[PDB]
Amino acid sequence: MKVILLEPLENLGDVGQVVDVKPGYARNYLLPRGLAVLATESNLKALEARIRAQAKRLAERKAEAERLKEILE
Amino acid sequence: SKVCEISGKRPIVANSIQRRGKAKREGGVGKKTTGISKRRQYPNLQKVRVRVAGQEITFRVAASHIPKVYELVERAKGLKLEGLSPKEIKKELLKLL
RNA sequence: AGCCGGUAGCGGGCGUGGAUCCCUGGAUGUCCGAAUGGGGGAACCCGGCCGGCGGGAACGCCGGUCACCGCGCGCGCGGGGGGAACCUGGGGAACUGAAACAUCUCAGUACCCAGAGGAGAGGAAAGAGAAAUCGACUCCCUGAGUAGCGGCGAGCGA
RNA sequence: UGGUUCGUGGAGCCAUGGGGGAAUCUGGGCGGACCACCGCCUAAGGCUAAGUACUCCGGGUGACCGAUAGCGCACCAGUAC
RNA sequence: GUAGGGAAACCGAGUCCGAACAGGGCGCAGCGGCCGCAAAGUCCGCGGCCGUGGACCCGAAACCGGGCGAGCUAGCCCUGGCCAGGGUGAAGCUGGGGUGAGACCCAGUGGAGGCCCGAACCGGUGGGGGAUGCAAACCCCUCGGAUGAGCUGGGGCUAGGAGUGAAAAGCUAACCGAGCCCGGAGAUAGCUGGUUCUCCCCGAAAUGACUUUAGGGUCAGCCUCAGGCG
RNA sequence: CGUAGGGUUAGGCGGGACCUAAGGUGAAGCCGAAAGGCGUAGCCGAAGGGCAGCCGGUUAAUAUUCCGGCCCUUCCCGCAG
RNA sequence: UGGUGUUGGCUCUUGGUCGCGCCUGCGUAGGAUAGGUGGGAGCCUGUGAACCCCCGCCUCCGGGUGGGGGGGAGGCGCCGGUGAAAUACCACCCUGGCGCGGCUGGGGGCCUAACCCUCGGAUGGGGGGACAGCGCUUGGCGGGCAGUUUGACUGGGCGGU
RNA sequence: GGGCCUGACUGCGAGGCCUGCAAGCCGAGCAGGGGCGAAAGCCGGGCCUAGUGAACCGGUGGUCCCGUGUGGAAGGGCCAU
Ligand SMILES: [Mg+2]
Ligand SMILES: [Mg+2]
Ligand SMILES: [Mg+2]
Ligand SMILES: [Mg+2]
Ligand SMILES: [Mg+2]
Ligand SMILES: [Mg+2]
Ligand SMILES: [Mg+2]
Ligand SMILES: [Mg+2]
Ligand SMILES: [Mg+2]
Ligand SMILES: [Mg+2]
Ligand SMILES: [Mg+2]
Ligand SMILES: [Mg+2]
Ligand SMILES: [Mg+2]
Ligand SMILES: [Mg+2]
Ligand SMILES: [Mg+2]
Ligand SMILES: [Mg+2]
Ligand SMILES: [Mg+2]
Ligand SMILES: [Mg+2]
Ligand SMILES: [Mg+2]
Ligand SMILES: [Mg+2]
Ligand SMILES: [Mg+2]
Ligand SMILES: [Mg+2]
Ligand SMILES: [Mg+2]
Ligand SMILES: [Mg+2]
Ligand SMILES: [Mg+2]
Ligand SMILES: [Mg+2]
Ligand SMILES: [Mg+2]
Ligand SMILES: [Mg+2]
Ligand SMILES: [Mg+2]
Ligand SMILES: [Mg+2]
Ligand SMILES: [Mg+2]
Ligand SMILES: [Mg+2]
Ligand SMILES: [Mg+2]
Ligand SMILES: [Mg+2]
Ligand SMILES: [Mg+2]
Ligand SMILES: [Mg+2]
Ligand SMILES: [Mg+2]
Ligand SMILES: [Mg+2]
Ligand SMILES: [Mg+2]
Ligand SMILES: [Mg+2]
Ligand SMILES: [Mg+2]
Ligand SMILES: [Mg+2]
Ligand SMILES: [Mg+2]
Ligand SMILES: [Mg+2]
Ligand SMILES: [Mg+2]
Ligand SMILES: [Mg+2]
Ligand SMILES: [Mg+2]
Ligand SMILES: [Mg+2]
Ligand SMILES: [Mg+2]
Ligand SMILES: [Mg+2]
Ligand SMILES: [Mg+2]
Ligand SMILES: [Mg+2]
Ligand SMILES: [Mg+2]
Ligand SMILES: [Mg+2]
Ligand SMILES: [Mg+2]
Ligand SMILES: [Mg+2]
Ligand SMILES: [Mg+2]
Ligand SMILES: [Mg+2]
Ligand SMILES: [Mg+2]
Ligand SMILES: [Mg+2]
Ligand SMILES: [Mg+2]
Ligand SMILES: [Mg+2]
Ligand SMILES: [Mg+2]
Ligand SMILES: [Mg+2]
Ligand SMILES: [Mg+2]
Ligand SMILES: [Mg+2]
Ligand SMILES: [Mg+2]
Ligand SMILES: [Mg+2]
Ligand SMILES: [Mg+2]
Ligand SMILES: [Mg+2]
Ligand SMILES: [Mg+2]
Ligand SMILES: [Mg+2]
Ligand SMILES: [Mg+2]
Ligand SMILES: [Mg+2]
Ligand SMILES: [Mg+2]
Ligand SMILES: [Mg+2]
Ligand SMILES: [Mg+2]
Ligand SMILES: [Mg+2]
Ligand SMILES: [Mg+2]
Ligand SMILES: [Mg+2]
Ligand SMILES: [Mg+2]
Ligand SMILES: [Mg+2]
Ligand SMILES: [Mg+2]
Ligand SMILES: [Mg+2]
Ligand SMILES: [Mg+2]
Ligand SMILES: [Mg+2]
Ligand SMILES: [Mg+2]
Ligand SMILES: [Mg+2]
Ligand SMILES: [Mg+2]
Ligand SMILES: [Mg+2]
Ligand SMILES: [Mg+2]
Ligand SMILES: [Mg+2]
Ligand SMILES: [Mg+2]
Ligand SMILES: [Mg+2]
Ligand SMILES: [Mg+2]
Ligand SMILES: [Mg+2]
Ligand SMILES: [Mg+2]
Ligand SMILES: [Mg+2]
Ligand SMILES: [Mg+2]
Ligand SMILES: [Mg+2]
Ligand SMILES: [Mg+2]
Ligand SMILES: [Mg+2]
Ligand SMILES: [Mg+2]
Ligand SMILES: [Mg+2]
Ligand SMILES: [Mg+2]
Ligand SMILES: [Mg+2]
Ligand SMILES: [Mg+2]
Ligand SMILES: [Mg+2]
Ligand SMILES: [Mg+2]
Ligand SMILES: [Mg+2]
Ligand SMILES: [Mg+2]
Ligand SMILES: [Mg+2]
Ligand SMILES: [Mg+2]
Ligand SMILES: [Mg+2]
Ligand SMILES: [Mg+2]
Ligand SMILES: [Mg+2]
Ligand SMILES: [Mg+2]
Ligand SMILES: [Mg+2]
Ligand SMILES: [Mg+2]
Ligand SMILES: [Mg+2]
Ligand SMILES: [Mg+2]
Ligand SMILES: [Mg+2]
Ligand SMILES: [Mg+2]
Ligand SMILES: [Mg+2]
Ligand SMILES: [Mg+2]
Ligand SMILES: [Mg+2]
Ligand SMILES: [Mg+2]
Ligand SMILES: [Mg+2]
Ligand SMILES: [Mg+2]
Ligand SMILES: [Mg+2]
Ligand SMILES: [Mg+2]
Ligand SMILES: [Mg+2]
Ligand SMILES: [Mg+2]
Ligand SMILES: [Mg+2]
Ligand SMILES: [Mg+2]
Ligand SMILES: [Mg+2]
Ligand SMILES: [Mg+2]
Ligand SMILES: [Mg+2]
Ligand SMILES: [Mg+2]
Ligand SMILES: [Mg+2]
Ligand SMILES: [Mg+2]
Ligand SMILES: [Mg+2]
Ligand SMILES: [Mg+2]
Ligand SMILES: [Mg+2]
Ligand SMILES: [Mg+2]
Ligand SMILES: [Mg+2]
Ligand SMILES: [Mg+2]
Ligand SMILES: [Mg+2]
Ligand SMILES: [Mg+2]
Ligand SMILES: [Mg+2]
Ligand SMILES: [Mg+2]
Ligand SMILES: [Mg+2]
Ligand SMILES: [Mg+2]
Ligand SMILES: [Mg+2]
Ligand SMILES: [Mg+2]
Ligand SMILES: [Mg+2]
Ligand SMILES: [Mg+2]
Ligand SMILES: [Mg+2]
Ligand SMILES: [Mg+2]
Ligand SMILES: [Mg+2]
Ligand SMILES: [Mg+2]
Ligand SMILES: [Mg+2]
Ligand SMILES: [Mg+2]
Ligand SMILES: [Mg+2]
Ligand SMILES: [Mg+2]
Ligand SMILES: [Mg+2]
Ligand SMILES: [Mg+2]
Ligand SMILES: [Mg+2]
Ligand SMILES: [Mg+2]
Ligand SMILES: [Mg+2]
Ligand SMILES: [Mg+2]
Ligand SMILES: [Mg+2]
Ligand SMILES: [Mg+2]
Ligand SMILES: [Mg+2]
Ligand SMILES: [Mg+2]
Ligand SMILES: [Mg+2]
Ligand SMILES: [Mg+2]
Ligand SMILES: [Mg+2]
Ligand SMILES: [Mg+2]
Ligand SMILES: [Mg+2]
Ligand SMILES: [Mg+2]
Ligand SMILES: [Mg+2]
Ligand SMILES: [Mg+2]
Ligand SMILES: [Mg+2]
Ligand SMILES: [Mg+2]
Ligand SMILES: [Mg+2]
Ligand SMILES: [Mg+2]
Ligand SMILES: [Mg+2]
Ligand SMILES: [Mg+2]
Ligand SMILES: [Mg+2]
Ligand SMILES: [Mg+2]
Ligand SMILES: [Mg+2]
Ligand SMILES: [Mg+2]
Ligand SMILES: [Mg+2]
Ligand SMILES: [Mg+2]
Ligand SMILES: [Mg+2]
Ligand SMILES: [Mg+2]
Ligand SMILES: [Mg+2]
Ligand SMILES: [Mg+2]
Ligand SMILES: [Mg+2]
Ligand SMILES: [Mg+2]
Ligand SMILES: [Mg+2]
Ligand SMILES: [Mg+2]
Ligand SMILES: [Mg+2]
Ligand SMILES: [Mg+2]
Ligand SMILES: [Mg+2]
Ligand SMILES: [Mg+2]
Ligand SMILES: [Mg+2]
Ligand SMILES: [Mg+2]
Ligand SMILES: [Mg+2]
Ligand SMILES: [Mg+2]
Ligand SMILES: [Mg+2]
Ligand SMILES: [Mg+2]
Ligand SMILES: [Mg+2]
Ligand SMILES: [Mg+2]
Ligand SMILES: [Mg+2]
Ligand SMILES: [Mg+2]
Ligand SMILES: [Mg+2]
Ligand SMILES: [Mg+2]
Ligand SMILES: [Mg+2]
Ligand SMILES: [Mg+2]
Ligand SMILES: [Mg+2]
Ligand SMILES: [Mg+2]
Ligand SMILES: [Mg+2]
Ligand SMILES: [Mg+2]
Ligand SMILES: [Mg+2]
Ligand SMILES: [Mg+2]
Ligand SMILES: [Mg+2]
Ligand SMILES: [Mg+2]
Ligand SMILES: [Mg+2]
Ligand SMILES: [Mg+2]
Ligand SMILES: [Mg+2]
Ligand SMILES: [Mg+2]
Ligand SMILES: [Mg+2]
Ligand SMILES: [Mg+2]
Ligand SMILES: [Mg+2]
Ligand SMILES: [Mg+2]
Ligand SMILES: [Mg+2]
Ligand SMILES: [Mg+2]
Ligand SMILES: [Mg+2]
Ligand SMILES: [Mg+2]
Ligand SMILES: [Mg+2]
Ligand SMILES: [Mg+2]
Ligand SMILES: [Mg+2]
Ligand SMILES: [Mg+2]
Ligand SMILES: [Mg+2]
Ligand SMILES: [Mg+2]
Ligand SMILES: [Mg+2]
Ligand SMILES: [Mg+2]
Ligand SMILES: [Mg+2]
Ligand SMILES: [Mg+2]
Ligand SMILES: [Mg+2]
Ligand SMILES: [Mg+2]
Ligand SMILES: [Mg+2]
Ligand SMILES: [Mg+2]
Ligand SMILES: [Mg+2]
Ligand SMILES: [Mg+2]
Ligand SMILES: [Mg+2]
Ligand SMILES: [Mg+2]
Ligand SMILES: [Mg+2]
Ligand SMILES: [Mg+2]
Ligand SMILES: [Mg+2]
Ligand SMILES: [Mg+2]
Ligand SMILES: [Mg+2]
Ligand SMILES: [Mg+2]
Ligand SMILES: [Mg+2]
Ligand SMILES: [Mg+2]
Ligand SMILES: [Mg+2]
Ligand SMILES: [Mg+2]
Ligand SMILES: [Mg+2]
Ligand SMILES: [Mg+2]
Ligand SMILES: [Mg+2]
Ligand SMILES: [Mg+2]
Ligand SMILES: [Mg+2]
Ligand SMILES: [Mg+2]
Ligand SMILES: [Mg+2]
Ligand SMILES: [Mg+2]
Ligand SMILES: [Mg+2]
Ligand SMILES: [Mg+2]
Ligand SMILES: [Mg+2]
Ligand SMILES: [Mg+2]
Ligand SMILES: [Mg+2]
Ligand SMILES: [Mg+2]
Ligand SMILES: [Mg+2]
Ligand SMILES: [Mg+2]
Ligand SMILES: [Mg+2]
Ligand SMILES: [Mg+2]
Ligand SMILES: [Mg+2]
Ligand SMILES: [Mg+2]
Ligand SMILES: [Mg+2]
Ligand SMILES: [Mg+2]
Ligand SMILES: [Mg+2]
């Protein structure tokens, strides 16, 4: 089963990285502890939504710093 | 082996037809019927427990229909579930069907 | 134009001032019984709270309500039980037939359980099937005992 | 495994107890294993009068019986016992 | 129904086998002067037989489906009651002996027991009646337990392929080697019996073949019946 | 046996308005195609447990039940400590 | 009783399948020990030469390869010998082996989080633990039980037919 | 006792035997294609009567009849076995 890696763990990957593991391991170990959530059609919209929200903040921050860069010097 | 909780899977009537002889397709005489035994085919059922709203809930569902339960709970986030006993929680988790 | 059933009598009244009687509605409707505040061996025993009579506090009668489940945001809604077959579903034999008997048959037949209605099921195609076509579900006739299936036997059967 | 005429047979079609397991019209299933090709339908919610079956029951009718018959009961019968 | 043959394709008064245009198999067509009549053919009724139905009628031993039973009996559970009266006298103790002490021994006290005798009580040995009896298990005498593995009282629990059984396949409401009632069912029965008013007509076989066949069924022979041949 | 009339008197006797035994069920809750089976805690389950009367007279018959004489048992209200 | 579901983690161990680093492969003839199909007419050295020595490795008893160190710039092809195929260097894969990696296959051990039990205490602790229980499938054991059969003749059975 | 040979034939078959059925026995003869004799002719196994098995099922080899719309195919059919 596909899941999203909530907390960065060892020998698995990056925080937020999608990883497919044996479902029983996640049903007995990962999900009850709140360390993982399986990848649905909705949390893809929510993961694209938070990544694109960090991008909506980033594109504002760096562009404002570049406009102020055009103001200074 | 009671009924399944989500889909309603239940044991059904079945038969076991005991056979002997060499089949026609392999070149032999043909498959015979040396007996018939009625049976009740039982579903593969386990106890999947999910902790929802700070309460431990139990479910008796077929192993193939396991992700359906986590779909129901994962989609049931819109409703307020705190304060309700595990019985009425097990009730309201089926309300999404 | 007579009546108070059977039902005559002892012994008594009523009826054109429309009694007896038939239809309809309402009242009433002890106790038991899904029984239901609560126990329980049916027509029984015993209490919560509240309103009421005796002279009534100890006692008793009366008035209303007091069980469980499911649903709806303590209050409301409903839910159970019943019935002549007849419905659908979930279950589901044997004698026997095969001149015996185990695949086969009686046969989804009896009975078992559940729910539904005055019907049920069913129902508007991932249908039929070669027809350039037919266009919902049910019932009748016919197809035909054809097609078929079968220790290709008995029998079954679109 | 069961239904279908099909008893396992070339055995399709409808439902599934077991493991897995898609896809959205360029999508899927049927035409009897299968392939190519060509025709028919849109599964994984459900609803729906009419035409049919029956008998506690009111009625009408009979080359149906007339008290050992016709219903266990024409009579205080599901009663005596 | 009128056109059949072949597995079939397919052909058709023919067709199949076959190389055959061989031979064979299987199938092909009214009476009188357009009409009268008759007929291949079809339809209804009435009657024979046969089939499927329960199938001419009366009959089980019994298989299963569901209900009803442990007030009898069998076991066990809960809580009660009871066993007149006598015999015999284990341990234990006090008195004495014993030995260096003990073991051990005799008397008193002392009262054990799936102990004995023997009533009420539970039996059912032996014979006698009883045999359409008083009674679907009685009467008499005699006989074994009778404080124990006891007797019974009440509430209870245990059931049909199950119960219960200090074992008999014993009992589970007087017939238990598979309980009673109802229902599938009108099971089935080649087997037993019976098969109802009258007169006229003909007249068998009891043999052969084969048959899980032998006291049953197919067929042949033997009877009868309308039509035709003579 | 056939007809009508009369006959069973209770705070004390047994029993319910008390408790619990097997067991019957049976909130929680377990199990089962259905019907259902099971279930500490609870309710129910008496001849067991708890409970407060002995004697005499009497009638066609009932009597510890009416009457008698002499004891007792529960609750409420009054008062006093 | 195997296999798959409830059903997981880690490690070791070797094994099957794939992406690699890879080293290995010795007939006549023929520098040395000839992998093939295609490419070829020139390639290395300051990504330091011929040659030398201190060790691995495959050794067909001659070597191959990785090299190190010093010396520090020189040597091996087509050509020819030569056989069927000729040689440096750069592609596509083999035989067999090793070092890493995808995917797997079992066993050894570890862990706990599914599962069972348990604890006046129960989102906790403890034990067992991916085992058992449980679903289907595979075969086996299967008078414990169920439905049946166990021929007819015959001066019944036995024999015999 | 030797020679050449495959008629221990293919497609058929007049009629009879036997006869309850199924069945078993005899069989001249016509055609194709064949052996031998000079010829005539003779050869559908053996001097004869016993040396056998009915339906059901599948295989093998061929045939190229069927092919569930269709073209194949599956599987049957026919033949011999
Ligand atoms: Mg990892
Ligand atoms: Mg936390
Ligand atoms: Mg910056
Ligand atoms: Mg600056
Ligand atoms: Mg079960
Ligand atoms: Mg279903
Ligand atoms: Mg079903
Ligand atoms: Mg069946
Ligand atoms: Mg099985
Ligand atoms: Mg099978
Ligand atoms: Mg099998
Ligand atoms: Mg097999
Ligand atoms: Mg086998
Ligand atoms: Mg065998
Ligand atoms: Mg064999
Ligand atoms: Mg098979
Ligand atoms: Mg084959
Ligand atoms: Mg197969
Ligand atoms: Mg073989
Ligand atoms: Mg069977
Ligand atoms: Mg079974
Ligand atoms: Mg809590
Ligand atoms: Mg829990
Ligand atoms: Mg559970
Ligand atoms: Mg609450
Ligand atoms: Mg929704
Ligand atoms: Mg009067
Ligand atoms: Mg009067
Ligand atoms: Mg009167
Ligand atoms: Mg009179
Ligand atoms: Mg008079
Ligand atoms: Mg009079
Ligand atoms: Mg008078
Ligand atoms: Mg008057
Ligand atoms: Mg009342
Ligand atoms: Mg009431
Ligand atoms: Mg009341
Ligand atoms: Mg009572
Ligand atoms: Mg009470
Ligand atoms: Mg009252
Ligand atoms: Mg209240
Ligand atoms: Mg009042
Ligand atoms: Mg008053
Ligand atoms: Mg009242
Ligand atoms: Mg009252
Ligand atoms: Mg109830
Ligand atoms: Mg409930
Ligand atoms: Mg319910
Ligand atoms: Mg509401
Ligand atoms: Mg509110
Ligand atoms: Mg409230
Ligand atoms: Mg209130
Ligand atoms: Mg409100
Ligand atoms: Mg209202
Ligand atoms: Mg309101
Ligand atoms: Mg409402
Ligand atoms: Mg209900
Ligand atoms: Mg109910
Ligand atoms: Mg009912
Ligand atoms: Mg039906
Ligand atoms: Mg049964
Ligand atoms: Mg029949
Ligand atoms: Mg018979
Ligand atoms: Mg029938
Ligand atoms: Mg059936
Ligand atoms: Mg029928
Ligand atoms: Mg039915
Ligand atoms: Mg019927
Ligand atoms: Mg049953
Ligand atoms: Mg129900
Ligand atoms: Mg309902
Ligand atoms: Mg109802
Ligand atoms: Mg109507
Ligand atoms: Mg309707
Ligand atoms: Mg139907
Ligand atoms: Mg057109
Ligand atoms: Mg159209
Ligand atoms: Mg229309
Ligand atoms: Mg009709
Ligand atoms: Mg019809
Ligand atoms: Mg049928
Ligand atoms: Mg169906
Ligand atoms: Mg069938
Ligand atoms: Mg199959
Ligand atoms: Mg099938
Ligand atoms: Mg269905
Ligand atoms: Mg399904
Ligand atoms: Mg599986
Ligand atoms: Mg898959
Ligand atoms: Mg389309
Ligand atoms: Mg495409
Ligand atoms: Mg297949
Ligand atoms: Mg629908
Ligand atoms: Mg209606
Ligand atoms: Mg009908
Ligand atoms: Mg009718
Ligand atoms: Mg009608
Ligand atoms: Mg009627
Ligand atoms: Mg009635
Ligand atoms: Mg009425
Ligand atoms: Mg009527
Ligand atoms: Mg009326
Ligand atoms: Mg009237
Ligand atoms: Mg009328
Ligand atoms: Mg009228
Ligand atoms: Mg009438
Ligand atoms: Mg009229
Ligand atoms: Mg009339
Ligand atoms: Mg008379
Ligand atoms: Mg009636
Ligand atoms: Mg009537
Ligand atoms: Mg009279
Ligand atoms: Mg009358
Ligand atoms: Mg009556
Ligand atoms: Mg009546
Ligand atoms: Mg020719
Ligand atoms: Mg030809
Ligand atoms: Mg010619
Ligand atoms: Mg000809
Ligand atoms: Mg010829
Ligand atoms: Mg000619
Ligand atoms: Mg001719
Ligand atoms: Mg002519
Ligand atoms: Mg003609
Ligand atoms: Mg003339
Ligand atoms: Mg003329
Ligand atoms: Mg005629
Ligand atoms: Mg004719
Ligand atoms: Mg004519
Ligand atoms: Mg008739
Ligand atoms: Mg006849
Ligand atoms: Mg007849
Ligand atoms: Mg008949
Ligand atoms: Mg019997
Ligand atoms: Mg029975
Ligand atoms: Mg039963
Ligand atoms: Mg029963
Ligand atoms: Mg009972
Ligand atoms: Mg007794
Ligand atoms: Mg007991
Ligand atoms: Mg005692
Ligand atoms: Mg006792
Ligand atoms: Mg006593
Ligand atoms: Mg004594
Ligand atoms: Mg004494
Ligand atoms: Mg004594
Ligand atoms: Mg003595
Ligand atoms: Mg003495
Ligand atoms: Mg002294
Ligand atoms: Mg002295
Ligand atoms: Mg003394
Ligand atoms: Mg003494
Ligand atoms: Mg004596
Ligand atoms: Mg006494
Ligand atoms: Mg006695
Ligand atoms: Mg006796
Ligand atoms: Mg006795
Ligand atoms: Mg005696
Ligand atoms: Mg005796
Ligand atoms: Mg005697
Ligand atoms: Mg005597
Ligand atoms: Mg006597
Ligand atoms: Mg007797
Ligand atoms: Mg005497
Ligand atoms: Mg004497
Ligand atoms: Mg005596
Ligand atoms: Mg004497
Ligand atoms: Mg004497
Ligand atoms: Mg005695
Ligand atoms: Mg004795
Ligand atoms: Mg004794
Ligand atoms: Mg005893
Ligand atoms: Mg005792
Ligand atoms: Mg007793
Ligand atoms: Mg008692
Ligand atoms: Mg009593
Ligand atoms: Mg009792
Ligand atoms: Mg009882
Ligand atoms: Mg039972
Ligand atoms: Mg019972
Ligand atoms: Mg049983
Ligand atoms: Mg009896
Ligand atoms: Mg007897
Ligand atoms: Mg007997
Ligand atoms: Mg008798
Ligand atoms: Mg003969
Ligand atoms: Mg005959
Ligand atoms: Mg004769
Ligand atoms: Mg003669
Ligand atoms: Mg009297
Ligand atoms: Mg008083
Ligand atoms: Mg008394
Ligand atoms: Mg007393
Ligand atoms: Mg007393
Ligand atoms: Mg009493
Ligand atoms: Mg009582
Ligand atoms: Mg009291
Ligand atoms: Mg009290
Ligand atoms: Mg009580
Ligand atoms: Mg006790
Ligand atoms: Mg209990
Ligand atoms: Mg009971
Ligand atoms: Mg119960
Ligand atoms: Mg309950
Ligand atoms: Mg409650
Ligand atoms: Mg309760
Ligand atoms: Mg309650
Ligand atoms: Mg409740
Ligand atoms: Mg709880
Ligand atoms: Mg539980
Ligand atoms: Mg559990
Ligand atoms: Mg249901
Ligand atoms: Mg039941
Ligand atoms: Mg039942
Ligand atoms: Mg219940
Ligand atoms: Mg239920
Ligand atoms: Mg229950
Ligand atoms: Mg509790
Ligand atoms: Mg009781
Ligand atoms: Mg007593
Ligand atoms: Mg008493
Ligand atoms: Mg009493
Ligand atoms: Mg007492
Ligand atoms: Mg009392
Ligand atoms: Mg006192
Ligand atoms: Mg006196
Ligand atoms: Mg007196
Ligand atoms: Mg007296
Ligand atoms: Mg007195
Ligand atoms: Mg008095
Ligand atoms: Mg008085
Ligand atoms: Mg006092
Ligand atoms: Mg008191
Ligand atoms: Mg009181
Ligand atoms: Mg498998
Ligand atoms: Mg060499
Ligand atoms: Mg190649
Ligand atoms: Mg080459
Ligand atoms: Mg060149
Ligand atoms: Mg050069
Ligand atoms: Mg050499
Ligand atoms: Mg050497
Ligand atoms: Mg390797
Ligand atoms: Mg990876
Ligand atoms: Mg392991
Ligand atoms: Mg291990
Ligand atoms: Mg370990
Ligand atoms: Mg670890
Ligand atoms: Mg550990
Ligand atoms: Mg560690
Ligand atoms: Mg358990
Ligand atoms: Mg707890
Ligand atoms: Mg826990
Ligand atoms: Mg701790
Ligand atoms: Mg282990
Ligand atoms: Mg375990
Ligand atoms: Mg479990
Ligand atoms: Mg298992
Ligand atoms: Mg299998
Ligand atoms: Mg084997
Ligand atoms: Mg098996
Ligand atoms: Mg087996
Ligand atoms: Mg076996
Ligand atoms: Mg063994
Ligand atoms: Mg046996
Ligand atoms: Mg055996
Ligand atoms: Mg069995
Ligand atoms: Mg058993
Ligand atoms: Mg059976
Ligand atoms: Mg069987
Ligand atoms: Mg035999
Ligand atoms: Mg015999
Ligand atoms: Mg004889
Ligand atoms: Mg003899
Ligand atoms: Mg003889
Ligand atoms: Mg003899
Ligand atoms: Mg003899
Ligand atoms: Mg003998
Ligand atoms: Mg004998
Ligand atoms: Mg014998
Ligand atoms: Mg013999
Ligand atoms: Mg001899
Ligand atoms: Mg012999
Ligand atoms: Mg031929
Ligand atoms: Mg001729
Ligand atoms: Mg002749
Ligand atoms: Mg013959
Ligand atoms: Mg003849
Ligand atoms: Mg073949
Ligand atoms: Mg072809
Ligand atoms: Mg073929
Ligand atoms: Mg074949």
Rounded to the nearest 5 percent, the helix, strand and coil shares of chain A are: 55, 15, 30
How far is the C-alpha of B85 from the C-alpha of B89, rounded, in Å?
6
Is the CB of B44 within 7 Å of strand D? yes
Which of B45, B74, B81 minimizes the C-alpha distance to A26?
Answer: B74
How far is the C-alpha of A26 from the C-alpha of A14, rounded, in Å?
17
**Strand A2-5 to A36-38 pairing:** antiparallel
Two tokens, residue A20: 């497919």
How far CA A31 is from CA of A17, A66, B53, B59, in Å, comes to 16, 43, 15, 17
How far is the C-alpha of B2 from the C-alpha of B21, rounded, in Å?
38
Two tokens, residue B72: 């129901």
The answer to whether residue A38 neighbours chain B at the CB level (below 8 Å) is yes
Breaks in chain B after residues, C-to-N cutoff 2.5 Å: none
Q: How was this structure determined?
A: X-ray
Q: What residue has token string 């077929």?
A: B62
Q: Is B93 exposed, middle or buried (0-12, 13-18, 19+ CB in 10 A)?
A: buried
Backbone CA torsion sign across A51, A57, A61, A67: positive
Resolution of this entry, Å: 4.0
**Cβ–Cβ under 8 Å, residues B62 and B10:** no
How far is the C-alpha of B51 from the C-alpha of B59, rounded, in Å?
11
**Cβ–Cβ under 8 Å, residues B61 and B5:** yes
Rounded to the nearest 5 percent, the helix, strand and coil shares of chain B are: 25, 30, 45
- Helix or strand (DSSP H, E) at A18: strand A18-20
Two tokens, residue B9: 């899977």
Amino acid making up residue B32: K
Asked if the Cβ–Cβ distance from A27 to B51 is below 8 Å, we say no
Two tokens, residue A40: 């649905």
How far is the C-alpha of B73 from the C-alpha of B66, rounded, in Å?
12
CA distance A11 to chain B (A): 26
Strand, coil or helix: A39? coil
Strand, coil or helix: A50? helix
CA distance A19 to chain B (A): 17
**Minimal Cβ distance to A32: which of B51, B66, B74:** B51
Residue B3 phi/psi, 5-degree rounding, is -75, 150
How far is the C-alpha of B5 from the C-alpha of B63, rounded, in Å?
12
